[PDB]
Amino acid sequence: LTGTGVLTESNKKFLPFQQFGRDIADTTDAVRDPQTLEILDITPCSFGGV
Amino acid sequence: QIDRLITGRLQSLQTYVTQQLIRAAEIRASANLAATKMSECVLGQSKRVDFCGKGYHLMSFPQSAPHGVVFLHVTYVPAQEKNFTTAPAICHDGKAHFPREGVFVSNGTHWFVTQRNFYEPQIITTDNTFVSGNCDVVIGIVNNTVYDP
Amino acid sequence: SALGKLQDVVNQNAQALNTLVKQLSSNFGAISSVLNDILSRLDPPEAEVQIDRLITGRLQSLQTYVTQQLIRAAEIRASANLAATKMSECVLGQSKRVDFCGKGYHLMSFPQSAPHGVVFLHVTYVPAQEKNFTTAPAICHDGKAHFPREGVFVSNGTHWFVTQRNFYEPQIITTDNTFVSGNCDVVIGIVNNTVYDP
Amino acid sequence: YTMSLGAENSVAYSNNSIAIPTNFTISVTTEILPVSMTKTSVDCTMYICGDSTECSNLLLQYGSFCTQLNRALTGIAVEQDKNTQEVFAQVKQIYKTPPIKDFGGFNFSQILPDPSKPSKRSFIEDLLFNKVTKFNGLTVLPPLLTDEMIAQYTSALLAGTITSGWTFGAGAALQIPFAMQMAYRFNGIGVTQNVLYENQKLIANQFNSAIGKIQDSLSSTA
Amino acid sequence: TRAGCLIGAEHVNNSYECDIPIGAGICASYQTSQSIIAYTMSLGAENSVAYSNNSIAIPTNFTISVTTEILPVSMTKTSVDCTMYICG
Ligand SMILES: *[C@@H]1O[C@H](CO)[C@@H](O[C@@H]2O[C@H](CO)[C@@H](O)[C@H](O)[C@H]2NC(C)=O)[C@H](O)[C@H]1NC(C)=O
Ligand SMILES: *[C@@H]1O[C@H](CO)[C@@H](O[C@@H]2O[C@H](CO)[C@@H](O)[C@H](O)[C@H]2NC(C)=O)[C@H](O)[C@H]1NC(C)=O
Ligand SMILES: *[C@@H]1O[C@H](CO)[C@@H](O[C@@H]2O[C@H](CO)[C@@H](O)[C@H](O)[C@H]2NC(C)=O)[C@H](O)[C@H]1NC(C)=O
Ligand SMILES: *[C@@H]1O[C@H](CO)[C@@H](O[C@@H]2O[C@H](CO)[C@@H](O)[C@H](O)[C@H]2NC(C)=O)[C@H](O)[C@H]1NC(C)=O
Ligand SMILES: *[C@@H]1O[C@H](CO)[C@@H](O[C@@H]2O[C@H](CO)[C@@H](O)[C@H](O)[C@H]2NC(C)=O)[C@H](O)[C@H]1NC(C)=O
Ligand SMILES: *[C@@H]1O[C@H](CO)[C@@H](O)[C@H](O)[C@H]1NC(C)=O
Ligand SMILES: *[C@@H]1O[C@H](CO)[C@@H](O)[C@H](O)[C@H]1NC(C)=O
Ligand SMILES: *[C@@H]1O[C@H](CO)[C@@H](O)[C@H](O)[C@H]1NC(C)=O
Ligand SMILES: *[C@@H]1O[C@H](CO)[C@@H](O)[C@H](O)[C@H]1NC(C)=O
Ligand SMILES: *[C@@H]1O[C@H](CO)[C@@H](O)[C@H](O)[C@H]1NC(C)=O
Ligand SMILES: *[C@@H]1O[C@H](CO)[C@@H](O)[C@H](O)[C@H]1NC(C)=O
Ligand SMILES: *[C@@H]1O[C@H](CO)[C@@H](O)[C@H](O)[C@H]1NC(C)=O
Ligand SMILES: *[C@@H]1O[C@H](CO)[C@@H](O)[C@H](O)[C@H]1NC(C)=O
């Protein structure tokens, strides 16, 4: 998978075989780093109207 | 491929925007109704039937709510009803007497005049009733004596 | 800015049309936004595809504009029904509906035309100068209680009058301003006084 | 089944028989109305073409779709703000109830603001608030009037109604004992005022019972 | 503010009628030497009604006020030639 966002230390407990998270509205939410066995939350980068 | 995707996403956005516009028109109608209710119901006393709760309206109290309003309608409802004999007028001395504000009633023996929305009998006097015509016209006139104070 | 409500409407319509016109300047994926150029530059085999793209785009723009017009026409129909109801129950009569025909107590209304709209001059009555008074719901005279027919009892400190409730018009308390009911052991707040009998 | 419209009830009509009520009830009903939506706003460029220059270049061919969509959503948000403003902001001033609650026996403590409360909301207001329950170009603009301000507006309207009747709407607020205001209202419904004063305690108790029943209904049924 | 970051606006404590709405109870406006200020909009001057169980306030004078209520009635009867617009 590919995307843009900020990776942060997560609070979830992924199963040993789960890789990619998913929110309710079919949006990627967290990922499992392939090398380090740590789960990273993907918070999309800040934006807003001017 | 990106032309296809852009067309699809634009169509989805247009559908969403049209649905939002229609639902917002609905909500604007609801908000106009709520404003009218607050103006005529809270700030005053409505005489429009079933516009401010079943029964005769007394008052209202507004209450906030998330993206909405809640009216507490305080209304007056007659509960306990009695059967009385009635007449459209009573004949005293050839004249026909009609109630100024109320209706004639009879518990079988005597004739009284009561306000229409609450049984409060009062002896019939020339200050409760007004004269008109004679007793040969009104269909159903009854006989009685109009006490003179 | 007073007539903004009207101006807005006009502006909106104009804006819509403008966008529609500007939608003629878009290629929508075609090789040119001018139909004549595509017809002059390509043979039918691919001119048909290009014109198909242009037609799809312009048809979508037209449908969008039509839907916008329909929704705005529903808005304006609602406003027109409101205006008709106001004219019926406000000009051709006297509405007792609170705040529906101007702030205060409604006296009358006068309609005025305006470009794509109407303007109501609502003539209303508003109390201005007010005075405090001590008041009582009823008064004993001979054990019986008297209640005011129209108006409320007031006291300027020493004497008691009966005055209509929308304009201080003190009148002596008598048996033609007040009506009797029962006795004055039940009403809460009663005060003593004499009820002059004509 | 074939649904029944209602219970059959023949009226004993007769040309010389009338039915007059001898007693009444003071019933409080509840009427719920929506006033506004959530002020949603969508950024078409980021939704359609999230972080993609080529997609944006292709999208720029379609003209001014985004301008009119954003304009419509902005109009929607403005309209919601206007709806809330016109529904609630109908009192020129902010009246507040005096500490004395000598309201002819009527008890408004369930609708007046609670000085010890989360956001100065009344009991029924708090019940209503408690009975009702991202970064992809979609945002939710905040309403112009915060719930505290709407609570203040309802408090001003309620205090005006309680302490002045209807006069506070027409013009300057004119105080009046609540019993006399209810006498006005009874005169307004064709029931002479003496009915009130002779049955003041009963009417006050009935109103309190009705408010309690409304409380229970709101607390029980979501 | 709860609506975001505002730059160029002088934050004052005094409340005023809302002129340019920002959000979350904050409105901005140009005021006096002159500059742009953002403030928590006021709902109106507060007041207390001297309510007591045996006190009534009655008017003695009056004013006849003519207010103005504006209502749109009709749009511009636009008509579009579909075939000429699409396929001129
Ligand atoms: C109809 O009502 C009248 C008025 O109350 C009744 O007449 C009175 O009856 C009581 C008995 O309860 C006597 O004490 C009064 O002296 C009577 N007053 C008069 C003026 O007669 C009458 O009895 C009632 N009739 C029926 C059938 O209920
Ligand atoms: C309250 O009103 C009464 C009635 O007008 C006032 O009594 C009158 O006062 C005038 C003097 O201003 C005398 O000439 C009358 O003879 C009085 N009439 C009666 C029946 O007493 C009374 O003074 C007023 N009280 C106040 C405090 O203004
Ligand atoms: C109005 O005047 C009457 C007098 O006619 C008062 O009635 C008296 O009440 C006292 C109790 O406070 C009794 O001790 C007397 O016996 C009563 N007198 C009579 C003749 O019944 C009445 O209290 C007065 N009202 C007010 C509100 O003071
Ligand atoms: C009118 O109705 C009310 C309530 O239905 C009556 O008040 C009740 O009176 C009875 C006496 O028989 C008491 O036991 C109840 O506790 C009362 N209820 C309340 C809520 O106070 C009232 O008596 C009726 N009045 C008439 C004239 O019928
Ligand atoms: C108005 O009614 C409320 C309840 O409906 C009263 O508050 C109650 O007061 C009693 C006595 O202290 C407490 O035991 C209850 O827990 C209270 N209930 C609530 C919901 O607060 C209130 O006292 C009444 N107002 C007046 C002036 O009597
Ligand atoms: C992958 O290799 C790194 C060092 O190159 C090591 O620290 C890490 O533990 C390895 N991960 C696994 C799952 O073997
Ligand atoms: C009045 O009389 C009719 C029949 O004459 C009867 O059905 C009705 O119940 C009576 N009304 C009351 C309140 O009892
Ligand atoms: C009412 O109906 C009865 C029943 O026949 C009749 O005798 C009487 O004359 C009628 N009265 C009126 C006023 O219609
Ligand atoms: C009423 O009394 C008159 C005599 O004064 C009589 O002629 C008439 O028949 C009476 N009507 C009724 C309904 O009793
Ligand atoms: C009535 O008395 C109160 C005292 O609490 C005062 O504030 C108010 O101004 C008085 N009314 C008028 C019209 O002056
Ligand atoms: C009105 O309130 C006062 C206290 O300010 C009290 O003394 C008086 O008894 C009350 N009157 C009534 C009728 O409740
Ligand atoms: C506004 O008041 C607060 C205290 O309530 C104070 O800290 C702040 O400095 C004040 N700001 C201005 C511009 O007066
Ligand atoms: C009522 O107000 C007007 C001002 O338009 C004033 O001229 C007039 O004297 C006032 N009337 C009374 C009785 O104060």
Swiss-Prot record, chain D:
Disulfide bonds join 44-66, 49-55. It comes from Severe acute respiratory syndrome coronavirus 2 (2019-nCoV). The chain holds residues 695 to 942 of 1273 of the full protein. Precursor of the fusion protein processed in the biosynthesis of the S protein and the formation of virus particle. Mediates fusion of the virion and cellular membranes by functioning as a class I viral fusion protein. Contains two viral fusion peptides that are unmasked after cleavage. The S2/S2' cleavage occurs during virus entry at the cell membrane by host TMPRSS2 or during endocytosis by host CSTL. The record marks 121-122 as: Cleavage. This is Spike protein S2. Changing residue 136 to K: In strain: Omicron/BA.1. Glycans are attached at residues 15, 23, 107.
